[PDB]
């Protein structure tokens, strides 16, 4: 049994660890540096931010990951989606479930018209996970991000509600 | 023995659980997403908001639900009513008790002239529970809400004090 | 042994209970709805309010009630008096003692020239308890309040210092 | 032609003068002392106070008086009414018009159930003005106010909507 | 030539005049009382309120009215519409132009799915002006408002984008 | 024609001058140093201070002086009175009129039971001006103040309301 | 062994009790009403108030009373003195010691030129305690205070440093 | 002679006009609604925002347009570029000059590694103006925006510094 | 005719001119750098600072200098004195008048017991002006200050009230 | 006649223009972008900043330039010096005078022990102006700044008080 | 083994004890009165005050005293020094160690040019302890302080870095 | 196993110790004085400061040191690097690992173009530890700092990314 539940202050500890792991943040072009105090101040800052919906992917025993619908625009009705499953719990398909539930939330609850995401071109794993759900590559932004000491190309992929 | 009491800060932990259940919030067109900190900040924000009266529905042993009189207008003397009995305690008549007690509170204490509510046209259970108390359908707002990925119609039902006590 | 002391923050919980009992509040035309947080914010708000003196009525064992000198005007030298003894401790004469001590505080310490009160015209018990101390009815405000789904009249009663010393 | 219009900051000057006249304030048990700065701070303080409705009685040429519905309670549905016409403009029936318009506002707009007022027992003028409109004496509060160096009795009068 | 533009702080002087006219506010169940300072503080308060879009209706020479899209919900994708053309400029078709431009703004720019409004059941002028644009009566809320000392019913009318552009 | 009115912010400039004249302040044991900005901040500070009533004494043409009812205590019902007529307008009897009107304000409007004042034992002019109105010396505080490089004694004088009406 | 020590937040509990005793406050014309919260807010308010010096009179075992040098004026170099010994500990001369130490503080530390006090004319006890230390009656303010339902005369007494 | 300067508060009025023209905003997928007060508050809000560089495009006589380097990221070293020339001054080549100067600012002063932009797939004029400077289409985001009552696709175009120096 | 009056906000423009003259600030070991805004913020900061009494020295026609009693300690009853007469008005005896008036103010109004000052050991002009009034050298602080790129000694001079008036 | 005077709010207009000129800011590695509002907020922010001393170089008629002693450290007793003369007024030796006066201020008034500065290696003009006053090159920081689309080397030069 | 370390908030309890001892504060002309809350607020106030360096003097087992470098001026490069060793730990040479360590801190870390102090002319113990380290009497300020009900003279002593290390 | 992590508030205590050791700070020209409260306020102050990246150097068991990338400039793309390994854990090579990991962070994550540092010319150990990683001396700032009662020269050393990848 797996579920998605709103992010809570009490969970920031977990979110702290993830945000300070190099391997995880790198694949998503993030910086693996964030004090718990800064994370808590950011949680408080965006407490009423209706452009974001940060969730927690939880299995039958503990929290396993995070999934975020960010840049939620209510005029164009689209939003970016980000998924991060801790490598400790990779091996059990949590990413696909979290992705499906996040898509269902964005379309059926937030009434979004389109979802999009940026994925490292070399991250064929996540690329295939996304393609399985109906996401189609719409762009190839070359040298759009800098990580591991090099500029990396990123696929801009997306999915329309009409296609879902 | 059942009662309604004022919603307390200490009760938010329960309300939180209800505000994140998809099945519960859906029937009320709400969004099943709210951090405990957000709920607390909102409680603090509306602490002195006289347009709201959020009661907790409690039974002989523990809390069971929440009934709220919101959008209380004191010029037109009307307010919206919302009921949410946790499914764990469903089928015990708590909904009817809480709804009737809230009607009495609105008419006899708040001196309201009219009460109204929006109910999904498919929730015949709630429509019947409301009709039993005297609420009559006054409108059908088609595609008025959006839930479960579809636009849902809503009966605007209401009850007048004159119809409730003559 | 009975006494009156100043209302303390730590006492608010007791007050909270009283402020949510419909039976206690209705006779005083108040609304039986108040979260503990709202009561605490109100206590902090009026902490320096010199127009109010809220005393706790305590018996030999525990707190039994509340008395209040509100709307204290220092130019006209008068103030409204309110008393509430929890029904659990009713029938033991606490209300008369609290009324006497509050009158003494108003006249001898606050240097008030007059005390007044509103009492439901049907509440003959409180009316006689007040008349015993010399409070005389000076007005009949018809339909002055709304409670229990009906408009209620109220006696405006009062006692001058010149009548208290005579 | 006479009218009632919401009180404005720009009118406080007038309200200042009235509030510092002994003869006027005395009949209404008020204190004839108020700096313009204090009056402006009080106007700002009660800007969003929904328990009050302060108006201005204006004739065909200038402002003549003030009329206030205060202590507006929306549970018991009643409020106190106060009227003050500057003596310069006494002689033309402005008080009766202002009173009638204030009653109409309280009953037909604020949906009030009862209106009440305190009037000095010796103020037979205002007493008769009020009795003409249907107000009935409900109480005689003796020595309820102190002015001109003596305690004065005050009639508590009122009018129900059913009677109006 | 007629246009709708964003409401500006400098325009409040006009809005003030409209917010204190009994005849205008009555048909919209509003209260004809608002100090210029209150209106300014409210404008400042809702400056960043994305649930509102308050347009001023202007003609070839001067301002004539105000049309507002309020209660903009971005989940259910619906909003309420309100029109007020000053009587001085009535009978010139400004109301129809402003209403149609506001409908277009809501459907084509705000990406709204439905528009609705409350109209007094006696204001057949406004009911007809709204029916001409495609609005259909979806409800009759009896005694829903209180104005001119009487409880007034209100037609809940609405228009769907699907019905407006297919 | 002479009058007393409430102290206004616009009057502070006048006050400023008086508050920087050594001759005027020394007799009242004050310090002749006060920037206009400090006086304005003090006026704003005590704007809502109900313990003080600062009146301007105005003649037929211009402002001539200041009178003050300070340390107004509403439990003991007394207050200190202070008067200062600019030497430019001295000798015309303004001080006696201001004293009489201030006493009348304290007794008849503020409902004071007693008025008191401090006056330099050498200032026989002010002493006689006070004794004319019924103020009687109740104390001689020796070396109570320090001015002009010397410790100065002061008469504590006062007048009861019972003596003022008799 | 007796001592005087600066008033501390931790001692306000004691100061609370004293301030709510009718018999004690009455003799000093104070009002026997004060919540602990108000007392703490007042302590915080006057934390940096250099016009006051509030002490605590402590014996060999516990706190017994309070003594305050208030209205400290540094131009005229004088201040009012107030002493309150809890009746429980009356019987042991704590008031005389506290008074002497407060006088020594005012004169030798604060460099005051004169000390004064108000004492109820009927309080012959405190009057004699003060006269023993050299205080001389300088005034009789009749009906200066109101307590126990009556106006009471108060002796204004004082002591110069030159006389001490 | 044409130039680019920093956006000043005094310029906001001009911006205001541009930000309320439907024709100008629709092509950039913006909403043509913004009170002057909101624009001023936004200018003050982002005054210290180092992620944005908003320049005014000025000609020999007056201000003609705006250019903007927004979403400036200093880790990945890229930023979005936006340009708007008022239609009154269109056809004179101002847009190309502004684009060139903004690219030069981004690459030579901000040390950016890449610039990118969104442009409506139908706006062939802007597309060619961008392609002239070396911006190459890297993506086609279908139904990425909503304007004029229709979902619109957008080319994601961009230019690297290595292509600009080569 | 010469006088000393309280320093006013409006006077800062003059003080500014003096606070940026190297020759003036040097003899007083101050730094000849201070923006008008800094001077204004400092005036506002010390507005209620009772440890300072900053007088402006004025003549028959215009302002000429500034004399200040700073570091006013009310336990030890001593304060430092500083004089600055603008060179334009030098050689007219303004310094002696201002210094003597300040001494009188300190001893006779502030009730100070001792006055002191630091003076450069080379400024024999100031040393003599101070000795003429009774100030006696009590210390020689070598290399106590740093000005004109060199460490300068300073005479600590002082005057007792007992020595000034016996 | 030339002088240096403290920077004033009223002068920020001038400072605005200079700060938005590309040629000037480039030689000093600054960014030629600054709104007048931002400049005023920065002036207010550093109003009490004792680590800075910003002056204005003024000739017989108008303001000509700016000179700043920044990063004033009072432990190590050193500070950076920056000079900017508007090109309109280049041709009259204002830079040398401003530099000399700033050095005199830093050493003789601020009691500094050492002054230092960064100058573009290609800016032989300013380099020689500085060398004339006794400044000696202590370092060559290669690619220390980025301007005009290229990394530029900067001479770190300085002057001790003992050498001055 | 002895050391000096920065004063910590947790250390205030000790400092409090020293700030209320008459014998200790007297020799330093301080007032033996300070609530723990006042001391804490002052510590918080001067938390970022670079003019002060308050060290605690600790021994092998526990805290023993406090040594402070105050009035640190960074233009003239001088500061005042104050030592207070609790009498319980007197006669063990802690004063000399702390004073010498503070001198070293001022000259070698803070880069001060001169150190000075005020000492009661009767405290020959402290005068000798200071002379042993090189401090030389530079002034005699008579009646400069007031303690134990008498005006006390004070030696202004000081030490130059040039005299300490040549 | 050794690692670098982000500096946490809970780590400040460790930092506090290091920041009060004269031996550790002197080599980095810092002052060995800092209360824990000041360090906490500084951590909170720079919490959102993107110009700094303060890492803790941790070994297999406990925290051993600190490394810092400060003065991070994103236009010129450079930053200063600082390292401090507590002497207790010196000699185990932690400093070289921390330096390498910090350089990697600056170049590969922050995208820095150059790193630089100041090191005491006598600290040959740190100089060689830096030269091993490719840092080359670019300047000799003589008498650039003041510590241990003497002015000290410092090597300005640095490493480009082009040299790090080559």
| d(C-alpha G69, C-alpha G105), whole Å | 9
Positive or negative torsion for Cα J19, J22, J24, J28? positive
Q: B83 in helix, strand or coil?
A: strand
Measured distance CA(G12)–CA(K19) in Å, rounded? 20
Q: Which element (helix H / strand E) includes C83?
A: strand C78-85
Chain L residues closer than 8 Å to H111 by CB = 74-77
| d(C-alpha I130, C-alpha F89), whole Å | 41
Both structure tokens of C137: 């009815």
Taking the C-alpha atoms of residue I31 and residue I35, their distance in angstroms, rounded to an integer, is: 12
F105 to chain C, any CB pair closer than 8 A? The answer is: no
| K35 → closest Cβ in G8, G104, G108 | G8
Distance separating alpha carbons of residues C35 and B17, to the nearest angstrom: 20
What residues in D contact B75, CB-CB < 8 Å? 109-111
**d(CA J152, nearest CA chain K) in Å:** 36
Nearest to L12 by CA among L48, L51, L63: L63
Token pair in block for residue B117: 């509510």
* Contact predicate G57/G81, CB 8 Å: no
Instruction: Dig out the tokens for E39 from the structure.
Output: 């209106």
Residue F27 has a CB neighbour count (10 Å cut-off) of: 18
Work out the number of other CB atoms within 10 angstroms of the CB of residue J93: 11
J161 lies within 8 A of chain L by CB: no
Inspect the interface and report whether the beta carbons of H8 and J149 lie closer than 8 Å. Answer: no
- Among residues K83, K80, K120, which one has the least CA distance to residue K99? K83
Cβ distance D56 to E20 under 8 Å? no
D29, D138, D146 member nearest C139 (Cβ):
D138
Size of interface C-G (CB pairs under 8 A): 35
- CA neighbor of C15 nearest in space, from C68, C69, C74, C51: C68
DSSP string computed for chain D = --EEEE--GGGHHHHHHHHT-HHHHHHTT--S---HHHHHHHHHHTTT-TT-EEEEEE-SSSEEEEEEEEEEETTTTEEEEEEEE-GGGTTS-HHHHHHHHHHHIIIIIS--SEEEEEEETT-HHHHHHHHHTT-EEEEEEEEEEEETTEEEEEEEEEEETTT-
Q: Which chains would you list as touching J if contact means 3+ CB atom pairs under 8 Å?
A: H, I, K, L
- Asked if B35 is an interface residue toward chain A (Cβ–Cβ < 8 A), one would say yes
For the record, the structure tokens of D146 come out as 């102190």
Q: Answer whether G36's CB lies under 8 Å from G13's CB.
A: yes
Contacts A140 to H, Cβ<8 Å: 138-139
> I165: buried, middle or exposed (CB in 10 Å: 19+, 13-18, 0-12)?
exposed
Chain K contact for L17 (CB, 8 A cutoff): no
- As a whole number of angstroms, the distance between CA I155 and CA I149 comes to 19
Nearest to L62 by CA among L27, L112, L11, L134: L11
- Calpha distance H43→H37 (Å, rounded): 10
Phi-psi region of J84 (alpha: psi -120 to 50; beta: other; left: phi over 0): beta
- The catalytically annotated residue of E118, E130, E151, E155 is E130
Tokens, residue A70: 């960010």
Rounded CA separation C88/J161 (Å): 88
- Strands G78-85, G63-73: pairing is antiparallel
* Per-residue burial over K36-65, b = 16 or more CB atoms within 10 Å of its CB, e = otherwise: bbbbbebbeeeeeeeeebbbbbbeeeebbb
Q: Quote the DSSP letter at residue A54.
A: E
Angle between helices J124-132 and J94-104 (to 10 degrees): 50
The DSSP line for C84-137 is EE-GGGTTSSHHHHHHHHHHHIIIIIS--SEEEEEEETT-HHHHHHHHHTT-EE
Q: Which chains touch K (3 or more CB pairs under 8 A)?
A: G, I, J, L
Q: Taking the mean position of all CA atoms in its chain, how far away is CA H6? A: 14
Q: Provide the CA E73 distance to its chain's centre, in angstroms.
A: 16
3-state secondary structure of F70: strand
**What DSSP line would sit under chain G, residue for residue?**
--EEEE--GGGHHHHHHHHT-HHHHHHTT--S---HHHHHHHHHHTTT-TT-EEEEEE-SSSEEEEEEEEEEETTTTEEEEEEEE-GGGTTS-HHHHHHHHHHHIIIIIS--SEEEEEEETT-HHHHHHHHHTT-EEEEEEEEEEEETTEEEEEEEEEEETTT-
> D6: closest CA among A42, H68, E39?
E39
Q: Considering just the CA atoms, what is the radius of gyration of chain D in Å? A: 15
3-state secondary structure of C148: coil
Chain C contact for D31, CB < 8 A? yes
Say if CB D130 and CB D117 are below 8 A apart.
Answer: yes
Nearest to K84 by CA among K145, K138, K4: K4
User: Which residue is catalytic, options C130, C146, C151, C164?
Assistant: C130
Tokens of G164: 């001490």
Residue H133's alpha-carbon distances to H99, H129, H165, in angstroms, are 8, 7, 11
The answer to whether residues H84 and H66 touch, using CB atoms and an 8 Å cutoff, is yes
The one-character DSSP state at I121 is: T
Count B/E contacts: CB-CB distance under 8 Å.
Answer: 58
- Grouping H, G, I as helix, E, B as strand and the rest as coil, residue A37 is helix
Helix (H) or strand (E) holding L161: helix L161-165
Alpha-carbon gap, residue G96 to G133, rounded angstroms: 8
Say whether H76 and A158 touch across the interface (CB within 8 A): no
Beta bridge partners of L78: L73, L114
Query: From the list H32, H36, H41, which residue is nearest E8 (CB)?
Result: H36
How far is it, in rounded angstroms, from Cα A150 to Cα H144?
Answer: 29
- Judged by 3 or more CB pairs under 8 A, whether K touches J is yes
CA–CA distance, B67 with B104 (Å, rounded to integer): 12
Q: How many other C-beta atoms lie within 10 A of the C-beta of residue G14?
A: 17
Minimal C-alpha gap between K148 and chain G (Å):
5
Nearest to F139 by CA among F119, F125, F166: F119
Any chain B CB within 8 A of the CB of D101? Answer: no
> DSSP H helical segments within chain F, as ranges?
12-19, 22-27, 36-45, 94-104, 124-132, 161-165
Strands J78-85 and J114-120: parallel
Distance CA G77, CA G111 (A): 7
Contact F110, F102 (CB under 8 A): no
Q: Is A137 helix (H, G, I), strand (E, B) or coil?
A: strand
- C-beta atoms of C144 and D78 within 8 A: yes
> What is chain L's percent helix, strand, coil content, to nearest 5?
35, 35, 30
- Inspect the interface and report whether the beta carbons of A47 and B31 lie closer than 8 Å: no
d(CA H13, CA H20): 11
The contacts of residue F150 (CB under 8 Å, 6+ apart) are none
Nearest CA in chain E to D47: E38
Would you call A32 helix, strand, or coil by DSSP?
Answer: coil
Chain I within 8 Å of J155 (Cβ-Cβ)? no
Rounded distance, CA H95 to CA H90, Å?
A: 8
Of the candidates L14, L8, L2, L81, the one whose C-alpha atom is nearest the C-alpha of residue A34 is L8
CB of L106 closer than 8 Å to CB of L70: no
K148 in contact with G at a CB cutoff of 8 Å? yes
Residue with tokens 């007031």: K146
- For residues G6 and K37, what is the distance between their CA atoms, to the nearest angstrom? 11
In contact, G146 and G152? CB cutoff 8 Å: yes
Residues H115, H77: contact at Cβ < 8 Å? Answer: no
> Do the Cβ atoms of G112 and G79 come closer than 8 Å?
yes
Strands D3-6 and D63-73 come out as unpaired
CB neighbours of F166 closer than 8 A, spacing ≥ 6? none
Tell me if chain B has a CB within 8 Å of the CB of E140.
yes
Backbone angles phi, psi at J67, to 5 degrees: -145, 130
Q: Could you tell me which residues come within 8 angstroms of residue K14 by beta carbon, excluding any fewer than 6 positions away?
A: K56, K63, K66
**For residue A139, how many other CB atoms are within 10 A of its CB?**
22
Instruction: Enumerate the residues of chain K whose CB falls inside 8 A of the CB of residue G111.
Output: 146
- When CB atoms are compared, the residue of I47, I53, I110 closest to F37 is I47
DSSP sequence for C20-77: T-HHHHHHTT--S---HHHHHHHHHHTTT-TT-EEEEEE-SSSEEEEEEEEEEETTTT
The region, left, alpha or beta by phi > 0 then psi within -120 to 50, assigned to residue H143 is left
**Cβ–Cβ gap B48/C41 under 8 Å:** yes
Q: B68 near B52, Cβ under 8 Å? A: yes
β-strands D114-120, D78-85: how paired?
parallel
K76 closest CA partner among K118, K108, K114: K114
Pair J130, J157: CB distance under 8 Å: yes
**Cα-based distances in Å from K25 to E159, I126, K32, K82, K95:** 83, 36, 6, 11, 16
Our CA-based measurement puts residue H64 at a distance from the nearest CA of chain A, in whole angstroms, of: 29
Residue F77 to residue G146, Cβ atoms within 8 A: yes
End-to-end CA distance of chain K: 29
Q: What is the DSSP string of chain H?
A: --EEEE--GGGHHHHHHHHT-HHHHHHTT--S---HHHHHHHHHHTTT-TT-EEEEEE-SSSEEEEEEEEEEETTTTEEEEEEEE-GGGTTSSHHHHHHHHHHHIIIIIS--SEEEEEEETT-HHHHHHHHHTT-EEEEEEEEEEEETTEEEEEEEEEEEHHHHH-
The residue written with tokens 């259970």 in the block is B125
Residues with Cβ within 8 Å of residue E34, at least 6 apart in sequence? D6, E16, E19, E20
Residue whose pair of structure tokens reads 């702290």 in the numeric block: A16
* CB contact burial E140-153 (16+ within 10 A = b; e otherwise): ebbbbbbbeeebbe
Catalytic entry in L27, L130, L155, L164: L130
Interface test with I, best of G48, G75, G79, G105 (most I CBs within 10 A): G75
Q: Is I164 a catalytic residue?
A: no
User: Mapping DSSP to helix (H, G, I), strand (E, B) and coil, where does residue J74 land?
Assistant: coil
Is there a contact between D148 and F108 if contact means CB atoms under 8 Å apart? Answer: yes
| CB pair distance less than 8 Å for D6 and E148 | no
- CA-nearest of K7, K91, K87 to K49 is K7
C-alpha span between A69 and A36 (Å, rounded): 22
- The partner residue sitting opposite H158, judged by closest CB among A78, A141, A160, is A141
Judging by DSSP bridges, how do beta strands I78-85 and I63-73 pair with one another? Answer: antiparallel
Inform me whether the C-beta atom of residue F110 falls under 8 Å from chain C C-beta atoms: yes
Which residue reads 């597309």 in tokens? Answer: H127
Residue with tokens 């005229």: G76
Helical segments of K2-80, H only: 12-19, 22-27, 36-45
**Contacts of A among chains (3+ CB pairs under 8 A):** B, E, H, L
Cβ contact G53:G110 at 8 Å: yes
Q: How far is G68 from chain F (nearest CA, A)?
A: 19
Task: Report the distance separating Cα K57 and Cα B52, nearest Å.
Answer: 61
Which of I82, I11, I75 minimizes the C-alpha distance to I40?
I11
Q: Cβ separation of F147 and I48 shorter than 8 Å?
A: no
D132: buried, middle or exposed (CB in 10 Å: 19+, 13-18, 0-12)? Answer: exposed
Q: Point out which residues pair with E151 in neighbouring strands.
A: E146
Chain L residue with minimum CA distance to J152: L76
Distance from C-alpha of F80 to C-alpha of F116, rounded to nearest angstrom: 5
DSSP assignment letter at L62:
S
Candidates J3, J42, J46, J47, partner chain I, best to mutate (most I CBs within 10 A): J47
Handedness of CA I39, I41, I44, I49 (dihedral sign): negative
Determine the Cα–Cα distance for residues H75 and H111; give it in Å rounded to an integer: 11
Antiparallel, parallel or unpaired: β F114-120 and F78-85 = parallel
Q: Give just the sign of the alpha carbon dihedral D94, D96, D102, D104.
A: negative
Resolution (A): 2.7
Distance CA G17, CA A129 (A): 72
Q: Assess contact for E72 and E110: CB atoms under 8 A.
A: yes
Q: Is B88 helix (H, G, I), strand (E, B) or coil?
A: helix
């Amino acid at each position: 049994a797996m579920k998605l539940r709103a992010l809570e202050y009490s969970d920031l500890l977990f979110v702290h660890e993830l945000n300070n792991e190099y391997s995880i943040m790198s694949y998503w072009f993030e910086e693996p540096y964030e004090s718990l105090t800064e994370l808590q101040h950011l949680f408080d800052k965006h407490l009423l931010d209706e452009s974001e919906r940060r969730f927690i992917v939880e299995d039958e025993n503990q929290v396993v990951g995070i999934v975020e619908l960010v840049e939620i625009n209510y005029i164009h009705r689209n939003c970016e989606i980000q998924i991060i499953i801790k490598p400790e719990f990779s091996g059990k398909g949590y990413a696909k479930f979290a992705f499906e539930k996040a898509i269902i939330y964005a379309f059926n609850i937030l009434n979004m018209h389109k979802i999009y995401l940026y994925v490292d071109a070399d991250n064929k794993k996540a690329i295939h996970i996304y393609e399985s759900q109906g996401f189609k590559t719409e762009g190839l932004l070359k040298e759009q991000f800098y990580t591991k000491g090099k500029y990396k190309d990123a696929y801009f992929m997306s999915l329309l509600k009409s296609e879902y």
